[PDB]
Amino acid sequence: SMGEIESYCNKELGPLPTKAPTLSKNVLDLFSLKGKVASVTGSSGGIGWAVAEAYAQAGADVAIWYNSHPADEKAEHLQKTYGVHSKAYKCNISDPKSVEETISQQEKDFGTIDVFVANAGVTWTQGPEIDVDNYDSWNKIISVDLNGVYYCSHNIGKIFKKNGKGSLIITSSISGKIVNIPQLQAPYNTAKAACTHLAKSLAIEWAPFARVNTISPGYIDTDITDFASKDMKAKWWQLTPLGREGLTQELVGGYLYLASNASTFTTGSDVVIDGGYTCP
Template sequence: MSTHASGLTPLPQPQPKLADHVLDLFSLKGKVASVTGSSSGIGLAVAEAFAQAGADVALWYHGNPKAIEHAKTLSEKYGVKVKAYKVSITSSAEVEQTIKQIVADFGKLDIQVANAGIPWTSGPLIDVEGDEDWHKIIDTDLNGAYYTAKFSGQQFKKQGSGSLIFTASMSGHIVNIPQLQAAYNAAKAGVLHFARSLAIEWAGFARVNTVSPGYILTEISNFVPIETKKIWWELIPVGREGQTKELVGAYLYLASDASTYTTGSDLRVDGAYAAP
């Protein structure tokens, strides 16, 4: 009998049962989705898109309790179950407990989006006193993604299925200018390769992919001076920042049965910034 290169998985694997209609392939009805960092910005937009597609949704927040209001609004608007969970993404124990609670509350976990992250605002790395700023970025943007992956992956393995989607960044592909953000770039590059590695490890039971946004109009970039944004616009081939609604299709594809043969992939949604 032929086996996979790992020696662990008999070949061939059974084919998935897929809907005939393309719109049904993109439906999330009957699925449970969990989105970290979803009290605002990209995470909230993704959570709403999943609710629109029929999924029950778990919202994760830390310092922004508006997620509780968002959960109520999304549930009433789209007729799905939505709950908010307060979590420190830098705590392995809290992440583990939250995923267990989500499974207890919803019955399962089909989709996990590891989206929580913070920007680097401290400037040139060697000019920063101490290591606190570096550790804050790595702990949130990389270690937080690791904790989310580890414990959602354990649930996926129990179920025999699941889709993990990381929010990476074009900054994992290129070095941004004029702002200097080596720590953030390193963290996001780590997320990209971590995801590819997990896609191989989990090929027998779950899919792992990434979305790499470019400059997106969210609260996370409100601190950026207009002079810097003008440079961005000149460097982005389409000449503008993106909207969160222009991202959600990528996440929906990777979450849905439309992408059952897609794993280990990255979708850049950056107005061609990283293309040249």
């Protein structure tokens, strides 16, 4: 440590400045995932399936994840339609040994993992916490929506570090930045705020070998909000600047942006896709 500029963030970067990547000079080539492997949790569900198919369209091999709804059909659909390799894996994301085994098997099956999306999650549907005295509900939210994200993150970081490259995207929510109304869901908001700032924290720790970012969707038309009444959804619309819920196909551009070489200087960022909801 003489004659070196040492990072205040992370000395594993080595002597500063680090070298910039060599990129295509054409912007469209930056979004290609040809030659890359993506792994997407919760891809039996609405957002995860849309992201999985978009990544296959961009050229990636795709590992699909499910728990209570088998998705082998879905992996086979990607193989037949786009000619990529795709396989589906069953895993309860709450079980850290299962997450480790699943990610290790995917590395064997596909050779490596270049892009990881920690997307699986569940809602809180029980109203104000003051009336919920059984902590099982709190524990469930924290276990699936925070611990499960961390188990995925801890395991994939080791692969990214071994290979010297990677992009991790965590699906957070506008709930990590604001307090949803009129449905009261403090435990879910808490878990999502934790996810957003876990991502920023890992962006510093992993900077020598990977990027880490969040996508924070607003209200998207999937089954996850099927608990909402029609008067509840109407109030969401009234408070959304664009005046509606979004579709899953309006998220896939952002997931591909973060996954690909279009975003090689983007890390620790929270890409909000919410029709303006967090602005008013």
